[PDB]
Structures are given as structure tokens and as C-alpha cells.
Ligand binder design. Structure first.
Ligand SMILES: Nc1ncnc2c1ncn2[C@@H]1O[C@H](COP(=O)(O)OP(=O)(O)OP(=O)(O)O)[C@@H](O)[C@H]1O
Ligand SMILES: Nc1ncnc2c1ncn2[C@@H]1O[C@H](COP(=O)(O)OP(=O)(O)O)[C@@H](O)[C@H]1O
Ligand SMILES: [Mg+2]
Ligand SMILES: [Mg+2]
Lengths: 463, 48, 511, 464, 220
């Protein structure tokens, strides 16, 4: 029939049921009074069950009746959801009335089998010099953005959307997980200014809502994507999938918020020891199958800029392309602030990008590495105390750094200058010429926040 | 002789700066280690 | 087995022996059981609500924290030394209310709407529930409207728009409080609202600020709430929420306001103390993981909103007005602890940040602004067209200049390009300074920055330049009064206006 | 009927039961029946069960032993006769010279001072030591940070401070020994006695041979002593303004950590009590001035591990107003006191506080002393006569400054003859300003050494 | 070749037990007078998973949340890997095979945080193994592929497991590497040193470059 509250702590609640009927491990629960829903967590036994909140915790009193649906969370799915903004429950918030689809799909499912695993080996450019050189993409691969606080992660997300999704034909899904509402409203208005708003479907869970809503939000969007990847194209396999996630770390934080309240002892740090499992079940629901291809973009907050906190490290092993930002480099004024060193891509062999590309990348990387080791001595001694080749190395690397600064068509709000979408050919030509030393007579500033090598020469002459 | 003298002076100054840097980081690290170990101890004691 | 329930009391057991049900008037009155450090476990209140205020036979109030199968845990609101178990408490049915409205202006008050200034019992027409959630996304409005600091450096590099959020941060006595009060005085004709919250400060200090705002007449559109260090922990931990609630009133009337969060760090300390006293397992640095949520719940409430949203909040009472609310947080670090846990969390939430460098303040540069790590994510949308046009890369140029100078400390083989760059960077550096209580008009910064970009200042003395500016402004306000009159009335940059500015500049250089 | 009986004993923490109709409140006082030990209510454990701490040794005690209460927090004797008397935390004489004369008793605890009583002004204490009097003026009701090792005359400086405050401002002096080592305490006593100042100070020590609660509560004890004296009004109202001396507040924080741990409560970031800031403040807010009378604090500060970012000194600086540091080299240079006139910092160092000219003068002195300090190395290495003669003038003038900042002490009179000299501002200011003008560049440095005002300096110089 | 899969989303105990099964197969080959080899991929995940499992059991935790027996786990795991006497297997086969002797080598993988070695699990596994093989990040970033650090990686076995010729040759190579490593701090000042030292450095540079190799390209 129905159960009722025993205790309330934070977002964790308990219900007492008759031994005749006790809810399954995941089921939607309707508070029979106010408007609040509950998700089963544990089979506490003896008619006792533990759950999490999906709304505010207020008005709730110990003993108020509550019913089960015998069914987990199922939200509307399909094209009718596209061009719309629904809640963590699929309820509209865009004031566009109810969604006109009655298809429903649960938020939980099993990871795709190994036999159905598919492999993406097809390049994907971005028009971004430092990335397209140092971090190639495969259409449908797993790409993540690492970065601390305010390091410009969000900006990079919008830039990538601008330079990929618009040039892309087909549907697209992005969801934010505990985000600043301002950016959300701005971004939605932005697509509204565009005409791709129909093509995208939109989801919010933000840092203003109870942690339960903060927790299982991305599940909805990734399920949307699973649907679409599995939706057969009319007379063919389904169109590709554009996936964009904001602050996946916030998922782990939401789990952390209650991890103690579950009676679980703390892990090696305040994190939950379960961490890896709920991480993986999330991660493995993102692969591209024989049917459909999913392009995963993930911005990852870095606590205290500690790359080796448990969460960044554990997340890290689930991406093919690694992109980390460095706070000091941004403090040095460069945008984007992408580290040339740590950021990698599994598509980096001569067998994929071409022998020449691989050679140039290896060379420039080694130069930067060398300089980085050299950087300490000049802090103690004069740079002149170094060999001439060493001075050449220093200047070469510094000008490379200058060249990495790429104006973007979103950054004009900060400054005003237009962006640059440099073709890879120009990038590779310029870098070969630079490591050819054809420009060892050029002021470093001629490379800063510019486009191609031709623009570098134009700047130097304007100097 | 003059140039060597000046360079030695500058070296002394840079040494002092680095000393400050290291000392600060050492304080931070000692604090962190103490925190970690005491957390370990209290968790282990709470286990019983 | 496990420990006893702190609810199995021979009295209660004997009572259930007499009869099980009808306990304590269906649990309308509660009796205290467990007492320690402003934390009270109580038996017998199921009618009570989580997060409810709890009345006491002591005439005091209690905060509902843990609704449990047999008992309730609560924190004491005020001093608790006057307590003991076996006393009566009840559930009000109202939930965490606090007076709010215009009447609050120019009053010194407790975090519970209690007049601590003793200037007459404060009244109200409305109270309101403290805890709320920020409105929906379809109700926010892009920030576009100016906010004045009267500060050259701030207004130039860091525009501030109404409804944004910008962290001020530095080390102890870097003038953080000074920056805040400047901002407050910087609002005396804007007609906007402003309110101040302080955490864990000395009553003497609070009175200093109070009297300063008095003599400045600031005590005419403002209110202050005090969380002294003597105050009970929960009081301090709650006070910012009360401040938020009081502020939102005017945003709920389509009007803008600024609230000054002082010592959020100490607030975090107090809340951590509370949590640990509740046997809550800690994480890094003993802070419970909810600290991020703790602050975010507060911060997100202050913002600019859609006019139809307030028109919905109104019942047609307002014909559509842009509602907004700006806030100002303060975070204190320990000797350049910029990567520190709590500040990192803060930045993750803020839309802007300002950091002040200790040595430059000791080097006399006031305000000692680290232009490097100082940004306003909105950008130029927060300033008049004049500032928008004149500025645009100056902060970045300054940062690159300081980088080069730091690298050039062991270099002496400069070309002319880098040499002039360093010269100009030094120049712009000494430009960006002013004294305490020195509100600049906008035209001030306008003419100054124009001259700076026009090389009229690279030609002058690194020291005299400050006089070069003071006398310049004196000259200009002496002569072109209607011009600045107009532009500070509008903030508009026109080419003829630029020519008039150039005329003023040359006339000054002629003097 | 308040007799309760012991129920459980571990270490120092003590548990008793009472009747569920008459339960003492927290911080009440319990005297063990038949013995002179006392118990302090900490947290109500329900069921008439209370957990308390003891005040002293705990030996031989056995459960079920009856104990009464006082229904009130701890009260101690207060009054005029309290001077020249050394009592425990309980205000009980240990000098062994009869009981306490007064019958006036006041509870140790009271709430924080009212916001209304915070004086709407802020002015400066006058002292005659000629160094703080310029560089780090004290506010009225301020906190003075003091640092440096022993053997540099800490006791001596305290002597002079007490002498001056009692002499001019008629101040009364209270001293609290937190975590005291007995030998130095006794020496300090003998010094109080020989230097005829004992009759004006009230003394209480807590040794590091006592359970922590003693050491924690001696603080509030001395505090209340000071409160009683200040609130004790004078003729026409306006009770005195008094100075408070407390040793090693860091030891206080440590003892707080002690008792928190003994309660079985989890540590803090470093491991202090999580409530650290609470007791720190509770100490602080009762240190201030009022519309009637004033109180000012001198506090010995030790920085363990030299961590300026450690929580305990960090919390300290949250209330510090002026910083004074003591040197080893300066004293070795035969300059007394050895106050470094370059690290001492005052919140009161503002033209809005000491006035415009005073502020600028002090800044100029600081500039000169800096300038000479970086001059020192070059003087050492590359000789002396290879520099600007203006720089040499700076050198001489700074040397005169340093020679001048030391002075005879009225307490030094009994020490080595040479009666001390009291000097206010407006002469120090003028003399220093004239020195900055260089109008005294015709005189050897000797006239500035061990001397009072500039008039005295010129008298000596003419006589030299 | 054979591989067993424990995907990241698989049930915890599955990872926790898989290496044991792999060892079972390896022994099975070993117990046929044969010898073979297995590869253990990142025992770290396995250790973490077992930690989780134990914690759910409310087991008494230890440093870095690890109960002590994790040692016992790894010990009794690697202990199973070794080479046996031909007599042992011959009687095991009940005389079905006589000539050959059984053997089994295994390779575990340990992942480091900031290259730290004092970490608990690394400490244990190092204390167990026959020796260390180490790789440094910056060397891979220095183009050194693979990026072995010979300064710390050794084998207690020694040339006993090398053929005559390779043992005959490796000596001067190791010596030159040691010399070059010796003069690292002065490597950036080849202007005032000894000429013979310069020759030693040049030899070290050449042999260093000699240690480069591509991927999937093994050598006879
Ligand atoms: N722009 C300025 N020009 C001159 N003096 C300044 C300026 N800004 C601040 N000051 C001085 O700095 C002193 C201390 O700053 P302030 O007291 O505002 O720091 P704070 O934010 O209160 O820090 P804390 O909370 O640690 O006290 C003030 O007495 C003030 O005179
Ligand atoms: N391409 C760019 N050029 C110049 N400035 C940039 C660029 N990208 C980001 N920034 C700066 O970095 C900040 C980006 O913050 P944001 O990306 O919104 O949050 P987060 O990085 O924490 O997700 C902005 O304040 C902006 O000034
Ligand atoms: Mg971010
Ligand atoms: Mg302040």
C-alpha cells in the first residue's frame, strides 16, 4: 500500500513498509502530501528502506504517507524533447507546455557488452592550432577537458561548440551539472539567436538545487544520447551523436555529499569508497557502438589544482584525448592556457596523422621539454652563462609559446578581436619553418594572439 | 673582478629568495601531513 | 549491540508503561534531554519541522536540525548557558522567519531582526522565510548595467555589473574592508540598495565602521548585521543567509542592491565547528564536503532577473522592471594561499575575482591590485561606452609587462621594443593608485586613460606623474566643466567629445 | 538537596549523578564533600548524569562519594587588598600570608561586553619609553603582540610598563601566569618585591604541574580581576584604565586542546580543538575600553615551528593590534630595550590616528633606518668612503637615531643607579624632527646614548 | 595467447578474483612440464576494489584506508609464480612427462602518483618482487621511448638468465651509463671540464640515443 517517514537527515530519508510489499532497489516514490519524489537506495530490511530526496526537504514530517510506483525514474524521450529544456525529471521548465512524446525510458541500464564495442578511428579537426597539433580527435571518441577553477574551461566548451556543432549536421545534446545559471541562460539565448536551437536538446542541474537533483542528472541526458545513437536513421544507421557535459566532477561531489549519510565509512579521503564503481557505470554508458557514434566532451574541474586527487586520476583513465589547463600559464596571459606538455591524444602516431605531422609534433614537444628543464638554471645564473644552442632553444620555445595564443570568436567579449580558425596545413607549415629557424630574427610579440605564420610576418613588419 | 663580484652578490640574493620559497612550501606540506595522519588515526580509532 | 538511544529515559519509559500514545500533546511541546555547547538533543516533537525555529520556556529559540525516529537534535540560537534538560520547547509552525523591508534602513541589528543598536524597537510589516532557492534559468537577465567603485584600477581593468559576483581576496589587513566601504560610499546617488554583513569581528571594529558610515551619511540607505566572535557559532553561520533574505526583498521589487559579505572564511570555520560537533565525518582540512554547496546556496540567489519573473512575483504590482542583486564576498588567505581549498571552491562559483598583493601595499601601492589574477567574466558589458572603448587590453598588457620585468630582473640586453614596453608598463603601474576615500568621477578615469594611451605620460616623471594627473584633473574640472558634466551624466564617447578631450589635454600640457 | 555522588572516574574527567528534579547547570561549581577538590560542569548527560572535570589531583577518590554544588559558576575574592598577593585559579592565597582580606566575590563568567559600551572614540596610551611612543603607539584598549626569546629583559620591560601606567595614569596591574614554571615565577616575585612595585599588582600563576583546567581558567580569573578593578569606579565615576599581562597565550590554546581531547572530541585542521576560535574570542571581547574605564592587554606570544600560517597565531592576529618584537643582536650591542624599530607594526600607524605630521615623521624615520640597513653590507664589503656623502650623512644620522632610542629606566635606577627619565611626546617628536633636519650633525653619537629628551642630549653634548 | 577481461564497470569481486584465475591457467601450463608467462595489468585497480569490498564489510581500516592483509593478498598471489623442478611436475603428471621442467614468469603493473615510491602498495609490491623496472615521464617527454630509468631498475637475477654473448657485452655499456649519470649535474657546462670527461659524456650521449626504439618493433 503505502509507507511513511521515520527520520529526516539532509537529503537521506527512510520509509517503513509492510513485509508484504517493500520497494525494489530503484523505484519512484510519491510523497502522498506535498510535491516531492523519492528514489530507493537501500533495502534496510524489516520493512525499512533508505532513500534520497528529489526536491526540497521542507514541510516533511515523520509519519507522512508515501507510495511507490514500482518503477524507477522514466522520462520522456524522442525528437519532441529536442529544442526543449526539461528538468531532472523531464518536466519542462522552458514554459513550452508538456512534451508531446509519451515514450518513456528509465535512467538506469546495463553497460554495453564487449561484443558490441565499436572503434572510432576517423580524424576530427577543430581549427585550433595547439589542439589540432597536439590533441587530434576521432569522430565519436572520448575527449575530456581538465582544468582548475576559472581556467577558462567553459569558454573552451563554447568555442568547440561554435567550431564543430555548427559545421556539424545532425542532432546534439548538452547538459550542465551543477553550473552557474547565468551562463546557462546566456547559452540558451545564444542558440536562440542561432537557428540550431531545434537541433540541440538541453538539460540543467545547477548548484542551487538539493543534492539529489544534483546527483542523477547527467543520467537523463546520456540516456537521451543512448536513445538517439540507437535510433535507426530512416533507411540507415542513426546519425552521429553530439554530447557535451559540464563539470562531471560535480557528480562525484554530489555522491560525496551523502556518502557519509549512507552510513558508509569514509574512504582514503572524505570521498566515498564506492567512487570508482559509480564513475565507471557512468563512463561505460558513453561508448559508441556498431549502431551510432557518440562524441563525448567533458569539462573536468580540478580541486586545488591537484591533478592527483583521487577523482581526477580515476576519471582520467576513461578518455582518449587529454586536455589540461595550467593556472600559471593563464596568469601569464595566454589564451588558450592549454599545457603543451601533459595534453595528449591516442590518435598520435605517424600511422594516423601522417609521418610528417608526428615528426613535427615530437620535435616541438622535445624542444619545450628541454626548455622546461633548462628553465631553473637561469633563475640562478645569467642566461648568457649558457651555450649558444641553449639560447636558441630558449628563444625558440618562448616564441612557440607566443604562437600558441589563438584569438577566438568568443573572446572578443573580453577584448574585442576576432577569432582565428587556422587550417592544419598552415599550422604545420609555420611550425616546420619555425623549427627550421627561418624566423630567429623576429620579435617574440609578433607571434602573440595571432593567426597564421603569414600573420606573424605581417605583425613583425608592423612592429 | 668587478663583474664576478656583482654576479656573486646577485647569486646570494637569489639564494635567499629560493630559501623563502622552500620554507613556505615546507610549512604547507608539514601542515598537510599532520592533517592526513591525524585523520587516519581518528578514523581507525572510530572503527572500534 | 550498540549504544543507548539518547531517548530511553526512565521517565519516558515509565510514561509509556502507563500509556504509549498521546505523548506530549501529540508532540506540540518538547522536553530537553541532552545538553552540550549550544547543541541540544530533545525528545518528543514530531509536529516539529526540520529547519523550524523552536521556541523555549527560556524565551529563546532553537534551530531544527535532525528529525529522527525517537528524538530531535537542534542547535541553540543565542547563549545556552541558561539551559538544562527537563525544560519545555515547542514548535512554532512558522519556519525560520526574519523581518524585512524598507524600515530596516539605518539600523544596527542582530541576525534575527533584533535591534542591537538600542535606538528603539525596530518594527516591520513583513517577515520572510530565510532558506529559499534561486529562481529558474528562464528568469535570469544578462548583466549590463554599471556599478561604480570610484577606483581607477578597479573601474578600469575590472568592470562590475549589477547582479554579478566578484571575489575580493588578499591577506590580513590588505584593505579589504576599505574596498567594501569605498564601494558603499560609491553608492550615494545610484539610488540602489546596500547592506552589510560582518562575521567574527571585534565589536570595536564594527562600531568603527558604523560611525564611519554615520558621519558619511551612509546610515540613510543601508543596514548592518553583526556576527561578532563572541556570538554563538550558529548565529554567525546563519547571519549571511539572513542578509541574503533581507537583500532579496528589493530584487523582489525589481530593484538592485549590494550586500557585503565580510569574513566568509570565518563563517566556514564556524560551520565546520558545528558539523564536527555533530560527529560528522570530515574530509580534507576537516571541512565537510557540503561547504561548496554551503556557499553556492547563498551565492546563486543574488543575480539579475527577467522582468516578467518579478511581475510574476508581483501580482501586477509592477509593470515589468529589471530585478537584480549584486553581492560582494571577502575571503582571507594565509600568505599567498591562492591555491587554498576554500578559495578555490569560491572561485568555482564566482563570476569575477579580485586579489590584492601584500608587498605592493607594503610597497605603498594602494590599492595593491594584482592585475594578473583579477577578472570580471562579464567583460565590457558592465561599463559605459567610454570605458568600453578606451579600455580593452590594458590589463593583459600590464600582466605581460610584469611578466617581462620579472624575467628581466637578470637580463640587461633589451632591444628598444621591450625597453619601451617595460617603461610604459611601469608608467601605467604608477597611474593606478589613489588614496583612501578618494571617489573618482568617471570623466576622471576617462581623460586619464585617454592621455595614457596617447603618450602624454611616457614623457613625464615616474614620480611627478601622480601630480601630473592630480593637477591635470584640477585644470580640466576648472576649465571644461560642462563637458565632464555631460559625459558623467551619460557616459557617452563621441568623436567631437574626443577632440574636446584632446584640446583639454594640450591646454594642460601647455600649463 | 544538592548532594550528588561520584559514579565514574577516568584520569581527570569526572562523572556524577543527581536527582532529575534538581540538576546543576553547566559551568557550575562542585565541591567534593570532605576534601578540597572542585568539579566543573561541562555537559549535561541527561538522566541526572553530568560529566565534569576536576581541579587538581584526583587520587584516592572512590565512586558513590557525595559531592555538593554551588548552583553558580566559580567566584573568587576581589578587592583592593588583592595586590601583592599570589593566589591560585580559585583565588586562594599561596603566598601563605593569611587569607584574603576582602569578602567581595564575583563569578568568573559573564557575557561579552555590550555593543553599546564600546567607546565611540579611539585614542592612545601615553608611555615614556620613547620607542613605541613614536613607531607603535598603543590604542586605548588595544592588544599588543610581543615576541622574542628570554633573557632580553621581558620582565624588565614589564616592570617599566607597570611603573609608568601606575605612576602617570594611576593604572593598576594584573598578571596571569599561564603554564608557568615555578622557578621563574618565584624570581619574578622577588623582582616584584625588590623593585618596590609588588604593592600595586595582583598575581596568579598556573603551573605546568597542574591538570589543564587550572591553566585554562587562570586566564578568566585574571580577566575578571581586571574587570572588577576597571568597573570599580573612581571619584566622579571613571574607574581606572588598567593593563593586563598574560604569558604565552599559545600555552592557553594548547591547554584548550588538552581539555577538548579529554572530552573525546575530534581534533581540528592541525589538531587543535575545533572550537578554538570560540574560546579565543571569549577571551578577547572582554578585553577593551568602555564609556567608563578601560583595559589594555600585554600578551607574551610564542610561535611554535615559526609558522605564520599556523591556525593558532592566525587566530591571534585576528585580534592583534600592535606588534612589538625583541632583538638579540640589539641587546648584544648594549642597547636596551632591544626593540627592533623595523619589524614592530601598529594598526594605529595612520595619519588619521597619530596625526599628519607625526605619521610622516615616523615614516621618514622608517625610511632612514631601512636605507641605512641596506647600506650596511656595502659599508662592510666595499669600504665606506666609496659612496655618496649624502649617504654617509644618512649613516651618521641613523647611527644617532639608534644611539638615541635607548633610554634610562626608572626601574633601572635600583638596578644600576642612573635614575630613569620619563618623556612624553611633543619633545621626542620635535627632537627627532630636528635630527631629521640635520641640525645636529655637529655632535658625536655619545650625547644620544642613555639619555632623556633632546634638551638633555644638547646639555650632555655641550658638556661633552 | 589468452586474455581475461574485467571491465571497469564489472562487479568489484570480478576484478578482485580475475588475477587468481589467470594464475590458475598459468600454473596449469606450468604443471605440464611447460613454461609460459602472464601479465598483470595495474594491480592498483584490484587493490582499490578490494578496499571497497572490505570497507562495505565494515572491516577495520588502516593507513590510506587499507587493511593490512592486502599484503597477504599480493604475496600469496605472486608467490604462486615461479619455476619448479622437473621431478615435481614429473611426479605430478605421475610420470606422464619426465624431461622438461616447469616455469612461470609474471609481470605486474603499478601506477605511481607524482612518481612517488613511498606509497603503500608500491612499497609492498617492491618489497615482494624480484626487482624493479622503472620508467620516468620526462624521459618519454625527452623522446626516450621507452623511457627506462636504469639508475634504479635492477634484477637480483643478474646475467644468469642471459646468454653468453649478451652478458659478455653488457658490461662496458652499464659502465658508460653509470659514468654519464655520474656527470649529470655538470652536463650543462661542457666548456671547462676535462677532455676525457667530454669523451665519456659523448659516448654516453651516443649510447643513450642507441637505446631508442619504436613500438611493435622487437629485435632479434
Ligand atoms: N587606498 C588606500 N590609501 C591609503 N590607505 C589605505 C588605502 N586602503 C587601505 N588603507 C589603509 O589600510 C589600513 C588597514 O586596512 P583595513 O583595516 O581596511 O584592512 P581590513 O580589510 O580591515 O583587514 P582586516 O580584516 O585584517 O582588519 C587602514 O587603516 C587604511 O588607512
Ligand atoms: N580565449 C580567451 N581569450 C581571453 N580570455 C579568456 C579566453 N577564454 C577564457 N578567458 C577568460 O577566462 C575566464 C573563463 O571562465 P569560465 O570558462 O567561464 O569558467 P570555468 O573555466 O571555471 O568553467 C573568463 O573570465 C575570461 O575572461
Ligand atoms: Mg568552471
Ligand atoms: Mg576586514
Amino acid at each position: 500500500s503505502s509507507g511513511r517517514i521515520i527520520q529526516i537527515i539532509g537529503a537521506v530519508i527512510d520509509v517503513e513498509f509492510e513485509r508484504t510489499s517493500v520497494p525494489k532497489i530503484y523505484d519512484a516514490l510519491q510523497v502522498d502530501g506535498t510535491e516531492t519524489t523519492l528514489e530507493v537506495q537501500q533495502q534496510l530490511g524489516d520493512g525499512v528502506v533508505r532513500t534520497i530526496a528529489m526536491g526540497s526537504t521542507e514541510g516533511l514530517k515523520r509519519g507522512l504517507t508515501v507510495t511507490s510506483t514500482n518503477a524507477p525514474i522514466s522520462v520522456p524521450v524522442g525528437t519532441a524533447t529536442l529544442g526543449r529544456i526539461m528538468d531532472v525529471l523531464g518536466r519542462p521548465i522552458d514554459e513550452a507546455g508538456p512534451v508531446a512524446t509519451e515514450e518513456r525510458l528509465p535512467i538506469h541500464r546495463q553497460a554495453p557488452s564487449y561484443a558490441e564495442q565499436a572503434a572510432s578511428t576517423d580524424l576530427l579537426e577543430t581549427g585550433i592550432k595547439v589542439i589540432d597539433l597536439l590533441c587530434p580527435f576521432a569522430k565519436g571518441g572520448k575527449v575530456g577537458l581538465f582544468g582548475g577553477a576559472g581556467v577558462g574551461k567553459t569558454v573552451n566548451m563554447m568555442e568547440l561548440i561554435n567550431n564543430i556543432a555548427k559545421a556539424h549536421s545532425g542532432l546534439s545534446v548538452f547538459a550542465g551539472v551543477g553550473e552557474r545559471t547565468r551562463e546557462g541562460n546566456d547559452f540558451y539565448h545564444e542558440m536562440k539567436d542561432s537557428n540550431v536551437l531545434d537541433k540541440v536538446a538541453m538539460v540543467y542541474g545547477q548548484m542551487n538545487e538539493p543534492p539529489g537533483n544534483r546527483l542523477r542528472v547527467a543520467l537523463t541526458g546520456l540516456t537521451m544520447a543512448e536513445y538517439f545513437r540507437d535510433e535507426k536513421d530512416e533507411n540507415g544507421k542513426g546519425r552521429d551523436v553530439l554530447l557535451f557535459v559540464d563539470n562531471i566532477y560535480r557528480y562525484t561531489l554530489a555522491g560525496t555529499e551523502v556518502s557519509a549519510l549512507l552510513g558508509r565509512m569514509p574512504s582514503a579521503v572524505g570521498y566515498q569508497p564506492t567512487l570508482a564503481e559509480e564513475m565507471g557505470v557512468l563512463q561505460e554508458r558513453i561508448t559508441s557502438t556498431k549502431s551510432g557514434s557518440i562524441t563525448s566532451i567533458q569539462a573536468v574541474y580540478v580541486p586545488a589544482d591537484d591533478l592527483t586527487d583521487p577523482s581526477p586520476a580515476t576519471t582520467f583513465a576513461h578518455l582518449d584525448a587529454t586536455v589540461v589547463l595550467s593556472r600559471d600559464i593563464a596568469s601569464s596571459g595566454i589564451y588558450p592556457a592549454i599545457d603543451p606538455l601533459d595534453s595528449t591524444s591516442r590518435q598520435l602516431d605517424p600511422l594516423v596523422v601522417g609521418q610528417e605531422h608526428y615528426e613535427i609534433a615530437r620535435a616541438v614537444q622535445n624542444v619545450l621539454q628541454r626548455y622546461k628543464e633548462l628553465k631553473d638554471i637561469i633563475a640562478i645564473l645569467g642566461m648568457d652563462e649558457l651555450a649558444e644552442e641553449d639560447k636558441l632553444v630558449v628563444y625558440r620555445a618562448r616564441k612557440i609559446q607566443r604562437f600558441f595564443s589563438q584569438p577566438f570568436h568568443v573572446a572578443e567579449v573580453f577584448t574585442g578581436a576576432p577569432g582565428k580558425l587556422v587550417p592544419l596545413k598552415e599550422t604545420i607549415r609555420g611550425f616546420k619553418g619555425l623549427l627550421a629557424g627561418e624566423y630567429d630574427h623576429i620579435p617574440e610579440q609578433a607571434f602573440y594572439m595571432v593567426g597564421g605564420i603569414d600573420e606573424v610576418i605581417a605583425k613583425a613588419e608592423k612592429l | 673582478q668587478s663583474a664576478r663580484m656583482v654576479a656573486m652578490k646577485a647569486a646570494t640574493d637569489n639564494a635567499g629568495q629560493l630559501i623563502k620559497d622552500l620554507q613556505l612550501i615546507y610549512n604547507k606540506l608539514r601542515q598537510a601531513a599532520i592533517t592526513q595522519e591525524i585523520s587516519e588515526i581518528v578514523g581507525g580509532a572510530a572503527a572500534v | 549491540m550498540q549504544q543507548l538511544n539518547p531517548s530511553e529515559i526512565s521517565a519516558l519509559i515509565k510514561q509509556r508503561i502507563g500509556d504509549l500514545d498521546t505523548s506530549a500533546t501529540a508532540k506540540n511541546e518538547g522536553t530537553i534531554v541532552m545538553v552540550s555547547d549550544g547543541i541540544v538533543r530533545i525528545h518528543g516533537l514530531a509536529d516539529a519541522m526540520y529547519g523550524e525555529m523552536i521556541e523555549f520556556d527560556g524565551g529563546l529559540f532553537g534551530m531544527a536540525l535532525n528529525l529522527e525516529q525517537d528524538s530531535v537534535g537542534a542547535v541553540v540560537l543565542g547563549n545556552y548557558l541558561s539551559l538544562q534538560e527537563g525544560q519545555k520547547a515547542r514548535c512554532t509552525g512558522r519556519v525560520l522567519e526574519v523581518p524585512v523591508g524598507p524600515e530596516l534602513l539605518g539600523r544596527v541589528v542582530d541576525a534575527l531582526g533584533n535591534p542591537i543598536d538600542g535606538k528603539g524597537p525596530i518594527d516591520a510589516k513583513l517577515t520572510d522565510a530565510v532558506e529559499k532557492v534561486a529562481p529558474g534559468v528562464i528568469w535570469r537577465q544578462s548583466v549590463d548595467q554599471p556599478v561604480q567603485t570610484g577606483y581607477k584600477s578597479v573601474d578600469t581593468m575590472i568592470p562590475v555589473g549589477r547582479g554579478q559576483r566578484e571575489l575580493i581576496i588578499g591577506d590580513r589587513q590588505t584593505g579589504k574592508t576599505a574596498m567594501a566601504i569605498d564601494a558603499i560610499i560609491a553608492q550615494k546617488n545610484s539610488g540602489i540598495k546596500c547592506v552589510y554583513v560582518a562575521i567574527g569581528q571585534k565589536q570595536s571594529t564594527i562600531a568603527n565602521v558604523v560611525r564611519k558610515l554615520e558621519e558619511t551619511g551612509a546610515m540613510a540607505y543601508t543596514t548592518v548585521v553583526a556576527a561578532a566572535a563572541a556570538d554563538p557559532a550558529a548565529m554567525q553561520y546563519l547571519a549571511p543567509y539572513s542578509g541574503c533574505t533581507m537583500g532579496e526583498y528589493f530584487r523582489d521589487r525589481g530593484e538592485d542592491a549590494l550586500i557585503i559579505y565580510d569574513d566568509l572564511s570565518k563563517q566556514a570555520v564556524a560551520y565546520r565547528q558545528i558539523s564536527l560537533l555533530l560527529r560528522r565525518p570530515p574530509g580534507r582540512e576537516a571541512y565537510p564536503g557540503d561547504v561548496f554547496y554551503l556557499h553556492s546556496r547563498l551565492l546563486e540567489r543574488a543575480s539579475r532577473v527577467s522582468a516578467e519573473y518579478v511581475e510574476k512575483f508581483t501580482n501586477g504590482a509592477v509593470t515589468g522592471k529589471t530585478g537584480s542583486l549584486t553581492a560582494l564576498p571577502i575571503i582571507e588567505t594565509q600568505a599567498g594561499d591562492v591555491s587554498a581549498f576554500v578559495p578555490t571552491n569560491v572561485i568555482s562559483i564566482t563570476d569575477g575575482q579580485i586579489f590584492l598583493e601584500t608587498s605592493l601595499f607594503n610597497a605603498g601601492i594602494r590599492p595593491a591590485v594584482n592585475a594578473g589574477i583579477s577578472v570580471s567574466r562579464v567583460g565590457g558589458s558592465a561599463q559605459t561606452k567610454i570605458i568600453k572603448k578606451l579600455s580593452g587590453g590594458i590589463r593583459t598588457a600590464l600582466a605581460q609587462y610584469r611578466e617581462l620585468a620579472a624575467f628581466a630582473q637578470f637580463a640587461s640586453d633589451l632591444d628598444e621594443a621591450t625597453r619601451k614596453q617595460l617603461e610604459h608598463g611601469q608608467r601605467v603601474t604608477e597611474l593606478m593608485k589613489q588614496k583612501q576615500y578618494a571617489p573618482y568621477s568617471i570623466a576622471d578615469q576617462a581623460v586619464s586613460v585617454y592621455a595614457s594611451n596617447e603618450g602624454y605620460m611616457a614623457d613625464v616623471e615616474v614620480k611627478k606623474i601622480v601630480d601630473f594627473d592630480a593637477a591635470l584633473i584640477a585644470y580640466f574640472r576648472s576649465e571644461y566643466a560642462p563637458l565632464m558634466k555631460q559625459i558623467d551624466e551619460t557616459g557617452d564617447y563621441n568623436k567631437d567629445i574626443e577632440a574636446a578631450i584632446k584640446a583639454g589635454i594640450e591646454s594642460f600640457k601647455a600649463t
